[model samples]
Target: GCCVCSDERGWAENPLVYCDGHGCSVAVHQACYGIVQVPTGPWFCRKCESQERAARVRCELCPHKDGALKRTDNGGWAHVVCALYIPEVQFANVSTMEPIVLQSVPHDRYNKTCYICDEQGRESKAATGACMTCNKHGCRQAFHVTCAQFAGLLCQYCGYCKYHFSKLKKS
Candidate 1:
């Protein structure tokens, strides 16, 4: 069995990492990693248990000074760049940090599909659609990670947010 201790390295490489393992995927508060489990679940490994015991910071919000993460009150945890917020829109607040849960895109044929391109689905089947939060105005709109980063999208122009993506001015 895996030990519940958070790698003594302060999990430096994984500073924000929570309970993670080959098969197990979940996050618990400090002291709850292994000590506690679902009503009908197995105990966590030592590595995860240790993380809960040593957690110090609760990065509920984006630590970045210029950006914030978007969250959903009606759904699971998420953090997109803060600047993405519109004037009237608001973001949910988090009292503590949590682990990011990854989900698999649908594999069934005939899905909604992404408007950007099929490149994002190169690795896997790909999501039904695609969306970009970047305001660059370039064809470099936001894309899925599945593709090689940017493929189907047009690169004819530079479209990126000045705050996150911008071209350097020539002197």
Candidate 2:
């Protein structure tokens, strides 16, 4: 129960948030912390931030994990000095304000198969991002972003362009 509507207490139309930080877990109403809406991507608790800062902070994509990591806009940690050099890091599209980092695939989705490759893409793969658009559109199909990119397209099972093509043919 992250939002007021789902909270066991009652329904109040208040916003709530779920934190998915490396070692944090909490779901509370946004109003309790003077927040208006839940932020996109991961959210971390202030306690975890200060606590990790007091000791050693680790970068999610680095090996040494001994740097003073800074939090990205997406709520992940990275070393400010070496963030640009991380292999997994990409330049943010300034026009669209896209994230410059890719998050790790959750454990539950590690064994998910890639529709294009017919192979399971584990967390250890080069690109483990999953595209769940098919489900969103009630198609029940899934694929990795890498696979979709390779195909030069995304989930378009509805054949939206077919009608246009048919119309053009008739004309």
Candidate 3:
């Protein structure tokens, strides 16, 4: 059969992805796979994801032992963004059977040095809990969560591209 999501509208522009799950002989469309660019290699289906969830798959980089842990091509589970920050070899070294000591920062003590502004102090640590930053291309750059929220984008680029962070203070 064709992709479970597509109708009999003839063949799709993108190729079909075959599923390897036991007793699951179904193929899926690229769009149904929720991807725009061509996938470089094999992809798993929702059934596999559910199975992993039931099996309590844990992210190697974070303490999240359940939920939508993105399984990488190298047979490791991690939060999609978390995987970006970590090197592939490091992920390979992690054993799935063992829970690592990785944990989220505590609310009260969490502070970050924003790469955007050279404030040089923990004064940027607001009481509004944790903040998000641009993680693309190894850019550990932090932005004021409130400003980023208003701008409607994390970073203009993944770091390699030419971009600029708005000045915190205007002259």
User: Candidate 2 local accuracy as lDDT?
Assistant: 0.40
For model 3 the TM-score comes to 0.26
- Over the stretch 33-61, how does candidate 2's per-residue lDDT look in tens digits? 33445667777644344555534444443
Estimated TM-score for each candidate: 0.29, 0.26, 0.26
- The whole-model lDDT of each prediction reads 0.29, 0.40, 0.39
What 10-residue stretch in candidate 2 is worst by lDDT?
154-163
The reply for model 2, stretches above 4 Å from the true place, is 1-98, 101-112, 119-127, 155-171
Error of 1 at 119 (Å): 1.4
lDDT score for residue 151 of model 1: 33
Clashes, model 3: 0
1-171 per-residue lDDT for model 3 (tens digits): 333232434255756666665544546555434345545665555545355444445444333233224454545554433332322212322423112122433432235443333342434343222334554546555543322423433332222111334432324
